[PDB]
Amino acid sequence: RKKIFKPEELRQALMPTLEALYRQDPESLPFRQPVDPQLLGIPDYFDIVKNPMDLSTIKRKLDTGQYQEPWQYVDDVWLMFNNAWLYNRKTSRVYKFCSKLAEVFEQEIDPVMQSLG
Ligand SMILES: CCOc1cc(C(=O)O)cc(-c2c(C)noc2C)c1
Numbered sequence: 001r002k003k004i005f006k007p008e009e010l011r012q013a014l015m016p017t018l019e020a021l022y023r024q025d026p027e028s029l030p031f032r033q034p035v036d037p038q039l040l041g042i043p044d045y046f047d048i049v050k051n052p053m054d055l056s057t058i059k060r061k062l063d064t065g066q067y068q069e070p071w072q073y074v075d076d077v078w079l080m081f082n083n084a085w086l087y088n089r090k091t092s093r094v095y096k097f098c099s100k101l102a103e104v105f106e107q108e109i110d111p112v113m114q115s116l117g
């Protein structure tokens with residue numbers, strides 16, 4: 001008797017919340033693709049961040065039906081935020097950017113989630 005979610009249904013409901021993150025310019029730019037530690041010259045990245053996540057990966061998961069239920073989408077969006085908050089200094093542009101995406105997500109996700117209950 002747990003609620004069931006069809007992937008097309010989940011995509012219709014959640015994709016505008018992902019679009020809200022992506023549209024944030026410039027704050028979304030560092031998050032639109034996986035961190036590349038070799039490019040950035042930060043070989044300790046994957047030692048610190050065990051489970052990388054980014055907006056393109058979440059999008060591909062939505063597009064291909066990999067979330068059974070909406071809380072799994074929330075988990076990935078927060079994995080991305082937490083990884084950035086963990087790795088980067090609080091004063092850093094990227095950390096502040098991350099916080100902006102979180103503030104946006106907070107506004108967008110609450111009414112969407114209630115509509116899925
Ligand atoms: C409100 C609908 O927003 C979108 C729809 C589609 C769609 O597939 O209809 C794709 C995107 C999207 C995102 C997120 N990141 O790159 C794109 C393109 C956003």
Ligand SMILES: CCOc1cc(C(=O)O)cc(-c2c(C)noc2C)c1
Pocket residue numbers: 029030031035040042083084087088094
């Ligand atoms: C294409 C630019 O992508 C990034 C640039 C920088 C940058 O330092 O210019 C930092 C990150 C990043 C994120 C997001 N989470 O940890 C790091 C590092 C990503």
